[PDB]
Symmetry: none
Subunit: 28 residues, 4 copies
């Protein structure tokens, strides 16, 4: 169960990093 | 409990994926 | 630790709901 | 492990809080 939680957390970071790129590319 | 946390994280992940795609649609 | 984890989750739901409220206003 | 997960969730919460503020700035 713990490994499956860390997998979900890793994918959330990916989404967060991708959302940050969209915000950093709208701003400029 | 860990399995329930996993499901909630998976829903948060899908939440961020929809948020990311909407920002892409707004910007384009 | 388990109760504090659920506290952090509930706060994530709040931010997610506020983010979608910002997205709906930007989309419109 | 649970204490580290709480840190990860607290950091994700702070990421979403910053995203919310950036979206508010974009909306204005
Ligand atoms: Cu299981
Ligand atoms: Cu603050």
């Amino acid at each position: 169960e713990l490994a499956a939680i860390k997998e979900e957390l890793a994918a959330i970071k990916x989404e967060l990093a991708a959302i940050k790129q969209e915000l950093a590319a709208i701003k400029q």
